[PDB]
Write a protein that binds this ligand. Structure first.
Ligand code: HEM
Ligand code: HEM
Ligand code: 6EX
Ligand code: 6EX
Lengths: 182, 182
């Protein structure tokens, strides 16, 4: 993924547990080479999965727990490290924001030309709920989606309950989530 | 399962979509025979699975969506139809409550002598998270667990993020969930 994603993971861990723990985690991941991540440069996905795996071992937490945290962090981190206006342009409510999400990533992708963004389709089951279809070229990041949805809830002061109802992981064509809000 | 469970399903559907729908649903499940469920009597599990499938066809919603709703409802329905004090005895926080859950179901089963309750084990990964191990003699109810957990979040005013990381369905030994709270 682009290095911004890894820089975020680093930031989150550095801020929550310290530079020593980040160093250990980098080292365990077999990335001591890399002095720093370049935000606008493409890295092999490997780098991200390894960091997450290594972060799991060192912190003694499951990978999935970290991806949930990281999902929520990213909402804050993007608003502060140069994507605040772009974020705000995507709307001022959760369902609006999610409807716009492919369009946000399209805009991101003019600037990051090699982006393989996820794809998100909403079916609104009412004014307070929806089905969210998450399609990705990558495996394993549904728990990140969950955290991202909870970060979006914080951003719009909406309470969101999210439950995953289909799993790419088992062989289903793609992750699907039921979501209830305010 | 005991009829209480089926009575709760009936109630949730009558209250949400009307008696006419309930009838259809009951009709579709091939249970027109049964005039009312007896709360303290044992039914074949068959009855609950048919009602759920039938509810899915009549309503145009996936089974899994209904089980999530039903899980959340049950938390409210038990507190109002005779299990309020027992619920409250199980604690005033989500992680406490989950640690007490086998004990709760044990008390329930002195009163319901043929109870096949689930089993839940918590490994706390921090003061705000845990791995929850759901063991059951039955298949299919993981989405019900998700709703129940959201229902418990409501009861304790805690925001809970839940993601399932192992699936009995696929032949893994049992369902496992990563959970983050408030
Ligand atoms: C300003 C806001 C955002 C920016 C700059 C951003 C940028 C990115 C970038 C650069 C990637 C890497 C894709 C790649 O390298 O191939 C990505 C992936 C991702 N984005 Fe965003 N994004 C933003 C907001 C969001 C939000 C709010 C969500 C919420 C659901 C979201 C969900 C994801 C997901 C799930 C991926 C995972 C990759 C995959 O599934 O294939 N993004 N995004
Ligand atoms: C407070 C009152 C509660 C009562 C009275 C109650 C009673 C029951 C009863 C009677 C069953 C049917 C089992 C059978 O017929 O053999 C059952 C199943 C179940 N209970 Fe509860 N329970 C309560 C709360 C909860 C809560 C909060 C949860 C949250 C996790 C929970 C999780 C379940 C699950 C998952 C089942 C499904 C059966 C299975 O996995 O085998 N229960 N409970
Ligand atoms: C990979 C990452 O932190 N994200 C999450 C959403 N968009 C990019
Ligand atoms: C069958 C069912 O939803 N439950 C859940 C908790 N206790 C009973």
């Amino acid at each position: 993924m682009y290095g911004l994603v890894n820089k975020a993971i680093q930031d989150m861990i550095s801020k929550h547990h310290g530079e020593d723990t980040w160093e250990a985690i980098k080292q365990k991941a077999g990335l001591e080479d890399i002095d720093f991540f370049v935000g606008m440069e493409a890295y092999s996905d490997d780098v991200t999965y390894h960091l997450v795996g290594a972060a799991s071992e060192v912190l003694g937490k499951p990978a999935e727990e970290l991806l949930i945290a990281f999902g929520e962090y990213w909402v804050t981190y993007t608003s502060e490290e140069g994507y605040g206006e772009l974020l705000a342009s995507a709307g001022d409510s959760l369902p609006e924001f999610m409807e716009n999400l492919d369009n946000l990533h399209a805009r991101v992708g003019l600037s990051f030309p090699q982006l393989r963004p996820p794809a998100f389709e909403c079916q609104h089951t009412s004014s307070k709920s929806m089905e969210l279809h998450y399609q990705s070229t990558r495996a394993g990041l549904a728990p990140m989606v969950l955290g991202l949805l909870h970060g979006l809830g914080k951003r719009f002061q909406t309470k969101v309950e999210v439950t995953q109802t289909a799993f790419r992981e088992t062989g289903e064509d793609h992750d699907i989530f039921s979501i209830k809000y305010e």
